[PDB]
Design a protein around this ligand. Structure first.
Ligand code: JVD
Ligand code: CL
Ligand code: CL
Length: 267
């Protein structure tokens, strides 16, 4: 059993693994029923991992929201760094989509309302996440959504998953918070259809695709509701000048419950 301050964990309880972090389920050492997640360095990418976890500490100290993973404690050592965080017991959106294949528009609305709340705070603070993808949208059991993985966040060297990155980011142009809105659009599209809207054989081929095609239109199924169709077209604008801004996103009709009134749940 390893310890970080008043918290402990076994590496048997591996719950997350990225290029730049390994995450374990843990517990409070005094209150054994208090579950946590302990985010550690990935030694395969030590230098970068250390840098990113350091940055994440600094960002999350400033960010407190019900839809952003909470930071409870942290320790920074010479060759290692540890973040003690809110445990999310429902895995991530990547696992969920693999299992479900596609989500109902109602489920999408439920998750996106929560994302939108978190993003509202980022917007106010002038923070861009830059690495939004299904792997860092965490679920917790009434499914709560929490945005994680803030190591790449900046106030107004990125690597991750180019299929979720805005054209201006891929093309090494100026970007702002609207780059996160593109990412959200791609995620929403994937929840709806099971696939990313724009794919290529390689990151370089995706760049070439975005460079060549000054108008990008995602293929939205005929059966998609008018509000969701409109939202997806506006989020997935190639040129950020044309892309929906945060205000318009936050107040979009799709982010209101449909149906507005339903049955009370089965007894
Ligand atoms: C695997 C990493 C690269 C990343 C995507 N996961 C996390 O940062 C993470 C953070 C807090 C959590 N609390 N419960 N589960 C969690 C997972
Ligand atoms: Cl690559
Ligand atoms: Cl490439």
């Amino acid at each position: 059993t390893e310890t970080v301050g008043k918290f402990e964990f076994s590496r048997k309880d591996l719950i997350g693994h990225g290029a730049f972090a390994v995450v374990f389920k843990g517990r409070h050492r005094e209150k054994h029923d208090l579950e946590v997640a302990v985010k550690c360095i990935n030694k395969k990418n030590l230098a970068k991992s250390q840098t990113l976890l350091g940055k994440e500490i600094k960002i999350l100290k400033e960010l407190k929201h019900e839809n952003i993973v909470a930071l409870y404690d942290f320790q920074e050592m010479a060759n290692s760094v540890y973040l003690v965080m809110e445990y999310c017991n429902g895995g991530d959106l990547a696992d969920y989509l693999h299992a479900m294949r596609t989500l109902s528009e109602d489920t999408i609305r439920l998750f996106l309302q929560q994302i939108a709340g978190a993003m509202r705070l980022l917007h106010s603070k002038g923070i861009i996440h830059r690495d939004l993808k299904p792997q860092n949208i965490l679920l917790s059991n009434s499914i709560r959504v929490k945005i994680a993985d803030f190591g790449f966040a900046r106030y107004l060297t990125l690597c991750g998953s180019p299929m979720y990155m805005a054209p201006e980011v891929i093309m090494a142009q100026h970007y702002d918070g609207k780059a996160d809105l593109w990412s959200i659009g791609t995620i929403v599209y994937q929840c709806l259809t099971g696939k990313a809207p724009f794919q290529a054989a390689s990151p370089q081929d995706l760049r070439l695709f975005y460079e060549k095609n000054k108008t990008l239109v995602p293929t939205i199924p005929r059966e998609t509701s008018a509000p969701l169709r409109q939202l997806l077209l506006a989020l997935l604008q190639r040129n950020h000048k044309d892309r929906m801004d945060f205000d318009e996103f936050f107040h979009h009709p799709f982010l209101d419950a449909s149906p507005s009134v339903r049955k009370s749940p089965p007894v």
